[PDB]
Design a protein around this motif. Structure first.
Motif, mmCIF file in Angstrom:
data_model
loop_
_atom_site.group_PDB
_atom_site.id
_atom_site.type_symbol
_atom_site.label_atom_id
_atom_site.label_comp_id
_atom_site.label_asym_id
_atom_site.label_seq_id
_atom_site.Cartn_x
_atom_site.Cartn_y
_atom_site.Cartn_z
ATOM 1 N N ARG A 77 9.224 20.897 0.045
ATOM 2 C CA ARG A 77 8.261 21.309 1.059
ATOM 3 C C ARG A 77 7.056 21.950 0.407
ATOM 4 N NH1 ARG A 77 10.078 20.302 6.444
ATOM 5 N NH2 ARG A 77 12.276 19.713 6.416
ATOM 6 N N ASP A 78 5.893 21.763 1.063
ATOM 7 C CA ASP A 78 4.711 22.550 0.728
ATOM 8 C C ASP A 78 4.989 23.918 1.387
ATOM 9 O OD1 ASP A 78 1.591 22.809 0.207
ATOM 10 O OD2 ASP A 78 1.885 23.357 2.310
ATOM 11 N N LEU A 79 4.352 25.018 0.929
ATOM 12 C CA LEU A 79 4.588 26.349 1.523
ATOM 13 C C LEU A 79 4.296 26.408 3.039
ATOM 14 C CD1 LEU A 79 3.365 28.774 -1.328
ATOM 15 C CD2 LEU A 79 5.698 28.072 -0.814
ATOM 16 N N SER A 80 3.522 25.443 3.580
ATOM 17 C CA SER A 80 3.289 25.330 5.022
ATOM 18 C C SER A 80 4.581 24.960 5.798
ATOM 19 C CB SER A 80 2.233 24.266 5.308
ATOM 20 O OG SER A 80 2.692 22.995 4.872
ATOM 21 N N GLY A 81 5.593 24.414 5.106
ATOM 22 C CA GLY A 81 6.852 23.989 5.711
ATOM 23 C C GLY A 81 6.932 22.491 5.943
ATOM 24 N N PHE A 82 5.905 21.729 5.504
ATOM 25 C CA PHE A 82 5.882 20.270 5.639
ATOM 26 C C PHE A 82 6.286 19.650 4.310
ATOM 27 C CE2 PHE A 82 3.998 19.298 9.775
ATOM 28 C CZ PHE A 82 3.540 20.536 10.157
ATOM 29 N N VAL A 83 7.138 18.612 4.349
ATOM 30 C CA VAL A 83 7.578 17.900 3.146
ATOM 31 C C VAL A 83 6.353 17.255 2.476
ATOM 32 C CG1 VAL A 83 8.967 15.972 2.238
ATOM 33 C CG2 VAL A 83 9.939 17.498 3.991
ATOM 34 N N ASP A 84 6.190 17.451 1.164
ATOM 35 C CA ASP A 84 5.086 16.899 0.349
ATOM 36 C C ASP A 84 5.685 15.886 -0.658
ATOM 37 O OD1 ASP A 84 2.469 16.527 -0.589
ATOM 38 O OD2 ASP A 84 2.634 18.039 -2.102
ATOM 39 N N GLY A 85 5.362 14.591 -0.529
ATOM 40 C CA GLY A 85 5.762 13.523 -1.464
ATOM 41 C C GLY A 85 6.303 12.231 -0.863
ATOM 42 N N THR A 86 6.537 12.172 0.434
ATOM 43 C CA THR A 86 7.277 11.040 1.051
ATOM 44 C C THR A 86 6.631 9.674 0.772
ATOM 45 O OG1 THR A 86 7.870 12.542 2.643
ATOM 46 C CG2 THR A 86 8.129 10.177 3.281
ATOM 47 N N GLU A 87 5.317 9.559 0.881
ATOM 48 C CA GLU A 87 4.597 8.269 0.693
ATOM 49 C C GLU A 87 3.965 8.182 -0.704
ATOM 50 O OE1 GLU A 87 4.792 5.537 2.768
ATOM 51 O OE2 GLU A 87 6.320 6.670 3.592
ATOM 52 N N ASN A 88 4.291 9.112 -1.588
ATOM 53 C CA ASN A 88 3.829 9.122 -2.975
ATOM 54 C C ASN A 88 4.460 7.905 -3.601
ATOM 55 O OD1 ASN A 88 2.369 10.221 -5.094
ATOM 56 N ND2 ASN A 88 4.154 11.276 -5.936
ATOM 57 N N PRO A 89 3.756 6.961 -4.503
ATOM 58 C CA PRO A 89 4.369 5.810 -5.198
ATOM 59 C C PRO A 89 5.735 6.137 -5.847
ATOM 60 C CG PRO A 89 2.030 5.786 -5.551
ATOM 61 C CD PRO A 89 2.336 7.070 -4.807
ATOM 62 N N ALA A 90 6.771 5.337 -5.565
ATOM 63 C CA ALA A 90 8.171 5.523 -6.024
ATOM 64 C C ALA A 90 8.564 4.543 -7.154
ATOM 65 C CB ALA A 90 9.097 5.380 -4.855
ATOM 66 N N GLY A 91 9.277 4.999 -8.199
ATOM 67 C CA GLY A 91 9.729 4.191 -9.327
ATOM 68 C C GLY A 91 8.675 3.998 -10.397
ATOM 69 N N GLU A 92 9.120 3.793 -11.647
ATOM 70 C CA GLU A 92 8.229 3.620 -12.800
ATOM 71 C C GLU A 92 7.262 2.437 -12.658
ATOM 72 O OE1 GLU A 92 10.152 3.855 -16.703
ATOM 73 O OE2 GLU A 92 8.322 3.134 -17.698
ATOM 74 N N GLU A 93 7.725 1.334 -12.115
ATOM 75 C CA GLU A 93 6.922 0.096 -11.987
ATOM 76 C C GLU A 93 5.702 0.303 -11.074
ATOM 77 O OE1 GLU A 93 7.981 -3.836 -9.778
ATOM 78 O OE2 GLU A 93 9.205 -3.565 -11.516
ATOM 79 N N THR A 94 5.916 0.785 -9.846
ATOM 80 C CA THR A 94 4.817 1.031 -8.900
ATOM 81 C C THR A 94 3.932 2.184 -9.379
ATOM 82 O OG1 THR A 94 6.286 0.253 -7.161
ATOM 83 C CG2 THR A 94 4.250 1.297 -6.422
ATOM 84 N N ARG A 95 4.509 3.229 -9.944
ATOM 85 C CA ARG A 95 3.725 4.360 -10.470
ATOM 86 C C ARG A 95 2.860 3.869 -11.636
ATOM 87 N NH1 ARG A 95 5.489 9.313 -8.493
ATOM 88 N NH2 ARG A 95 5.309 10.496 -10.437
ATOM 89 N N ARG A 96 3.359 3.017 -12.522
ATOM 90 C CA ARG A 96 2.481 2.448 -13.584
ATOM 91 C C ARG A 96 1.327 1.634 -12.960
ATOM 92 N NH1 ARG A 96 3.637 2.229 -18.941
ATOM 93 N NH2 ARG A 96 5.586 3.265 -19.498
ATOM 94 N N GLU A 97 1.611 0.786 -11.971
ATOM 95 C CA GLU A 97 0.610 -0.056 -11.287
ATOM 96 C C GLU A 97 -0.516 0.797 -10.680
ATOM 97 O OE1 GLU A 97 0.100 -3.316 -11.145
ATOM 98 O OE2 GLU A 97 -1.465 -3.254 -9.595
ATOM 99 N N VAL A 98 -0.160 1.923 -10.051
ATOM 100 C CA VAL A 98 -1.138 2.801 -9.409
ATOM 101 C C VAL A 98 -1.903 3.705 -10.398
ATOM 102 C CG1 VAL A 98 -1.434 4.648 -7.666
ATOM 103 C CG2 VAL A 98 0.087 2.717 -7.189
ATOM 104 N N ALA A 99 -1.199 4.345 -11.342
ATOM 105 C CA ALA A 99 -1.768 5.368 -12.227
ATOM 106 C C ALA A 99 -2.288 4.919 -13.598
ATOM 107 C CB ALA A 99 -0.735 6.472 -12.433
ATOM 108 N N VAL A 100 -1.743 3.832 -14.141
ATOM 109 C CA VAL A 100 -2.025 3.502 -15.566
ATOM 110 C C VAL A 100 -3.020 2.333 -15.731
ATOM 111 C CG1 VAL A 100 -1.068 2.901 -17.803
ATOM 112 C CG2 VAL A 100 0.229 4.390 -16.253
ATOM 113 N N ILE A 101 -4.065 2.531 -16.524
ATOM 114 C CA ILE A 101 -5.089 1.480 -16.752
ATOM 115 C C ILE A 101 -4.392 0.311 -17.488
ATOM 116 C CG2 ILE A 101 -7.255 1.008 -17.949
ATOM 117 C CD1 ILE A 101 -8.144 3.805 -17.161
ATOM 118 N N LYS A 102 -4.601 -0.927 -17.039
ATOM 119 C CA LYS A 102 -3.865 -2.086 -17.560
ATOM 120 C C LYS A 102 -4.418 -2.740 -18.829
ATOM 121 C CE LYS A 102 -2.382 -2.139 -12.970
ATOM 122 N NZ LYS A 102 -2.721 -0.691 -13.096
ATOM 123 N N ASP A 103 -5.719 -2.851 -19.013
ATOM 124 C CA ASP A 103 -6.222 -3.583 -20.208
ATOM 125 C C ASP A 103 -7.560 -3.003 -20.692
ATOM 126 O OD1 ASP A 103 -7.872 -4.682 -18.332
ATOM 127 O OD2 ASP A 103 -6.259 -5.946 -17.683
#
Ligand code: HEM
Ligand SMILES: [Mg+2]
Length: 301
Positions: free
Chosen positions: A137-163
């Motif tokens: 939870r964020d200190l407001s009492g709401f869960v923080d992270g639910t729609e954040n990219p999940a797994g190494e493969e999708t997180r690499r696709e979103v965060a890491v420069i490819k070439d």
């Protein structure tokens, strides 16, 4: 002949983190050897504490990165602007150190190694100790992270420069928010839910046509012809119960564009409407940094 990502970008569910933001006092050349020493220290700490699942990132501000790279690559990098003509302040610094793991004690030893490596070449402006709160939870009492990219493969696709020259690198955005929980508690739980765009206890998404356009999800869940502008968030709660507390916002993206579009939306620059979370919390820092790949930290010198 490939590139290796810095260890602190991709890890998920880390319960603790340390963020250090600093300015360069001396010659920019002092950052070359210090960065090589630090990534070496991180590898040493990973070998000594394998069950900590330790990761770290060293990232640079526009001015110093243009000097270190000789103006090559990092095409989107720039000093962080003020958004909403002031609603989001700007505190652009030269160096960002992000350390995350399952053990705060290990992060603290790694933070001390970072300070010993850079020494008196840097002026520490901020040091924030992040902690995962109950039910993520964020200190407001709401869960923080639910729609954040999940797994190494999708997180690499979103965060890491490819070439290209920046392959393996990433753009970083940091912004410290100060919550006014007294102001939040004056709001009824249904009004808080319309402010976020999800239910509080059950963490269910409120439909887009049922929630206000100023709701958090309406401001940041952005699509360009059906393609979402995704980012890899590593934000965590911080502070003391009686003093300053809130969320240390941190996000990585292969394109700085995705982060900028969300900030333009949140702070009123896109359609004149601003994020409803501004009724109880405010940003007080802001900076953009470029996290090079591990082998380009070794090529500094
Ligand atoms: C006080 C500061 C902030 C708080 C408390 C906060 C809180 C939350 C919460 C509760 C969610 C919903 C659960 C979820 O993660 O999916 C969320 C989602 C999200 N937030 Fe924030 N957030 C803040 C700032 C930011 C900022 C500054 C950005 C980006 C510039 C951002 C981007 C996002 C994104 C992309 C999502 C997922 C949206 C979706 O696709 O459903 N947030 N945040
Ligand atoms: Mg969505």
């Amino acid at each position: 002949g490939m590139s290796q990502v810095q260890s602190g970008i991709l890890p998920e569910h880390c319960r603790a983190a340390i963020w250090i933001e600093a300015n360069l006092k001396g010659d920019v050349n002092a950052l070359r050897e210090a960065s090589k020493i630090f990534v070496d220290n991180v590898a040493t700490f990973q070998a000594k504490f394998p069950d900590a699942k330790l990761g770290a990132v060293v990232a640079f501000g526009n001015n110093v990165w243009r000097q270190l790279s000789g103006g090559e690559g990092a095409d989107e990098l720039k000093d962080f602007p003020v958004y909403g003509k002031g609603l989001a302040p700007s505190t652009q610094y030269d160096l960002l150190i992000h350390i995350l793991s399952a053990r705060h004690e290990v992060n603290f030893s790694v933070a001390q190694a970072a300070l010993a490596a850079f020494g008196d070449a840097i002026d520490v402006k901020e040091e924030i100790h992040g902690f995962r709160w109950v039910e993520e939870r964020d200190l407001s009492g709401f869960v923080d992270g639910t729609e954040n990219p999940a797994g190494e493969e999708t997180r690499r696709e979103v965060a890491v420069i490819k070439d290209g020259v920046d392959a393996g690198g990433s753009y970083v955005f940091v912004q410290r928010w100060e919550h006014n929980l007294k102001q939040l508690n004056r709001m009824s739980v249904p009004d808080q839910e319309m402010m976020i765009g999800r239910t509080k206890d059950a963490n269910e998404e409120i439909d887009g046509d049922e929630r206000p356009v100023t709701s958090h999800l309406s401001r940041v869940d952005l699509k360009e012809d059906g393609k979402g502008l995704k980012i890899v968030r590593q934000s965590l709660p911080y502070g003391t119960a009686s003093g300053t507390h809130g969320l240390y916002f941190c996000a990585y993206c292969a394109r700085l564009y995705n982060i900028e579009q969300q900030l333009l939306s949140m702070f009123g620059d896109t359609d004149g409407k601003r994020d409803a979370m501004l009724r109880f919390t405010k940003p007080v820092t802001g900076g953009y940094y470029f996290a090079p790949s591990l082998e380009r930290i070794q090529a500094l010198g």
